[PDB]
Amino acid sequence: DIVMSQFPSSLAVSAGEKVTMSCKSSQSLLNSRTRKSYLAWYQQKPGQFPKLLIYWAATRESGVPDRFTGSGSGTDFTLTISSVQAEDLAVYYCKQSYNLRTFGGGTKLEIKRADAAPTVSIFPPSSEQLTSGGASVVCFLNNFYPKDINVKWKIDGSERQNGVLNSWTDQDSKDSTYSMSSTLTLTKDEYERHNSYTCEATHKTSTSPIVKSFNRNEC
Amino acid sequence: EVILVESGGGLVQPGGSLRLSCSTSGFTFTDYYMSWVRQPPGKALEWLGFIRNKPKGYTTEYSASVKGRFTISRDNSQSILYLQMNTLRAEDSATYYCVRDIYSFGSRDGMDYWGQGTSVTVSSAKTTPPSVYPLAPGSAAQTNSMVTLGCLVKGYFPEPVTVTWNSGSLSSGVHTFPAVLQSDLYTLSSSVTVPSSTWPSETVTCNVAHPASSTKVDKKIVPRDC
Numbered sequence: 001d002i003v004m005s006q007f008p009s010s011l012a013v014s015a016g017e018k019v020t021m022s023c024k025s026s027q028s029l030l031n032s033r034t035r036k037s038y039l040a041w042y043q044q045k046p047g048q049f050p051k052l053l054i055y056w057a058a059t060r061e062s063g064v065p066d067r068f069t070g071s072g073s074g075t076d077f078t079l080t081i082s083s084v085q086a087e088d089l090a091v092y093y094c095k096q097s098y099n100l101r102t103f104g105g106g107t108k109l110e111i112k113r114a115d116a117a118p119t120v121s122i123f124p125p126s127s128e129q130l131t132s133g134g135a136s137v138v139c140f141l142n143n144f145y146p147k148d149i150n151v152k153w154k155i156d157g158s159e160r161q162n163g164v165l166n167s168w169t170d171q172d173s174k175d176s177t178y179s180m181s182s183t184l185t186l187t188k189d190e191y192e193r194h195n196s197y198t199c200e201a202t203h204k205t206s207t208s209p210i211v212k213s214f215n216r217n218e219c
Numbered sequence: 220e221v222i223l224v225e226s227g228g229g230l231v232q233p234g235g236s237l238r239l240s241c242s243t244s245g246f247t248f249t250d251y252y253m254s255w256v257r258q259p260p261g262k263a264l265e266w267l268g269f270i271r272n273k274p275k276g277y278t279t280e281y282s283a284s285v286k287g288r289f290t291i292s293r294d295n296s297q298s299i300l301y302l303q304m305n306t307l308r309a310e311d312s313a314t315y316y317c318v319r320d321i322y323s324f325g326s327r328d329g330m331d332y333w334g335q336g337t338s339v340t341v342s343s344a345k346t347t348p349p350s351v352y353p354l355a356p357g358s359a360a361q362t363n364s365m366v367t368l369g370c371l372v373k374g375y376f377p378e379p380v381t382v383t384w385n386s387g388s389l390s391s392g393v394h395t396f397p398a399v400l401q402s403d404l405y406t407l408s409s410s411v412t413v414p415s416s417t418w419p420s421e422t423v424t425c426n427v428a429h430p431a432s433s434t435k436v437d438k439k440i441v442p443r444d445c
């Protein structure tokens with residue numbers, strides 16, 4: 001069998017910059033008669049199916065932007081993207097078709113962009129959820145960058161760090177920003193024995209946290 | 220227009236078996252080699268095997284990883300591709316893709332068309348439908364202009380769950396967070412942002428689909444949360 005590998009595992013550049021990534025095979029993919037190397041490149045944007053970009057090592061699929069160029073032969077290959085665009089955010093995979101087919105492990109291309117502050121929204125538990133005996137307080141932190149962000153929850157002025165779960169979206173394909181949800185889940189009983197619920201977001205873009213809260217008693 | 224559509228995915232218990240289908244249209248099915256490729260959540264693509272075209276006699280070949288356990292077949296009159304998966308285990312949990320492969324060696328190469336894929340989860344846990352909760356702003360507007368709403372999808376299994384807003388109309392301004400597995404149950408949330416002159420004067424509904432339990436829920440976001 002042939003082992004396919006790629007490097008680096010991940011790379012980051014700003015829009016407009018050029019990027020190169022590599023692919024290597026355990027054995028030569030060159031056919032001595034045809035002189036071609038049977039290597040292809042695929043692009044898989046976050047959440048969608050893969051798209052064929054290049055085949056036979058250097059032939060671009062019709063319709064694929066000329067910014068994408070493949071090169072190499074034998075066991076060593078490269079994919080170059082000149083003038084990277086925000087939408088180029090994706091994992092790129094190489095694949096040999098010399099003997100059956102085998103995919104490499106992929107190279108994730110991340111995009112760097114200007115810092116942006118998050119937009120914070122807080123939501124008290126729905127009446128529906130209360131009927132099930134549970135209570136989730138949710139805070140969305142949308143369209144920010146960089147990814148690193150801290151959320152602090154406070155109930156009646158006290159910090160609550162138990163029962164809190166955070167979840168980040170993949171980078172956006174159009175504006176390269178991130179979004180994240182912070183959810184504090186309590187039982188209906190505990191939720192009802194407190195008044196103030198606050199989520200505080202601390203991000204690089206400011207020295208002062210963005211705070212959102214409601215009182216429940218003012219509900 | 221080439222169309223590949225996979226079906227058959229769902230929850231299977233360890234040691235169980237499953238048959239996936241791939242309907243095709245828009246091209247002469249028999250002229251093409253067809254492959255199956257899978258992808259575990261957050262992991263790399265993995266080629267599983269192929270079935271050759273007419274001139275080559277429709278012969279099959281498989282990846283060492285599944286050879287002896289998965290088989291591929293094709294119905295040349297209906298133009299449907301199949302993947303029979305036997306004796307499954309956790310490691311087989313993944314999205315399975317139907318892909319059009321080459322039609323000849325000297326013409327070109329590459330898997331040029333792919334289906335959307337169908338998810339398979341191998342687990343002993345029980346299929347559990349989700350609860351969908353509408354998230355409207357609390358009784359506190361503040362600096363208005365844009366309004367953000369959301370919906371919490373909680374306690375379901377297995378993944379995935381599909382969330383749309385006004386049947387997709389509200390694309391853009393929508394963010395759906397990755398599900399988090401707790402115990403044997405998943406929870407995720409989705410947010411949508413629209414101008415305040417749109418909601419609540421106009422309707423906003425989050426549409427949730429959970430294939431595995433054949434469930435579809437519509438939750439209109441009604442004002443007066445808290």
Ligand SMILES: N[C@H]1[C@@H](OP(=O)(O)O)O[C@H](CO[C@@H]2O[C@H](CO[C@]3(C(=O)O)C[C@@H](O[C@]4(C(=O)O)C[C@@H](O[C@]5(C(=O)O)C[C@@H](O)[C@@H](O)[C@@H]([C@H](O)CO)O5)[C@@H](O)[C@@H]([C@H](O)CO)O4)[C@@H](O)[C@@H]([C@H](O)CO)O3)[C@@H](OP(=O)(O)O)[C@H](O)[C@H]2N)[C@@H](O)[C@@H]1O
Nearest residue numbers: 031033034038097098099100271274275321323324325328
């Ligand atoms: N059944 C086939 C067989 O007839 P035969 O049993 O009488 O020989 O072979 C003839 C072709 O003539 C012979 O060619 C080989 C050398 O073959 C190759 C080469 O130089 O390596 C490749 C041949 O490929 C194809 C074909 O077009 O004929 C397609 C191949 O495709 C796949 C696969 O399905 O197997 C998928 C593809 O993506 C890629 O992975 C490819 C792989 O890289 C090839 O190694 O495989 C495959 O189906 C092969 C088949 O395995 C061949 O047996 O056929 C083809 O292009 C031929 C040229 O036609 C030659 O002019 O070149 C000679 O081997 P040798 O050791 O070099 O001498 C052999 O002696 C020739 N008889 C084929 O037409 C017939 O259908």
Ligand SMILES: [Mg+2]
Nearest residue numbers: 006021022107
């Ligand atoms: Mg690479």
Ligand SMILES: [Mg+2]
Nearest residue numbers: 102103265266
């Ligand atoms: Mg592989």
Ligand SMILES: [Mg+2]
Nearest residue numbers: 278279280281
């Ligand atoms: Mg054979």
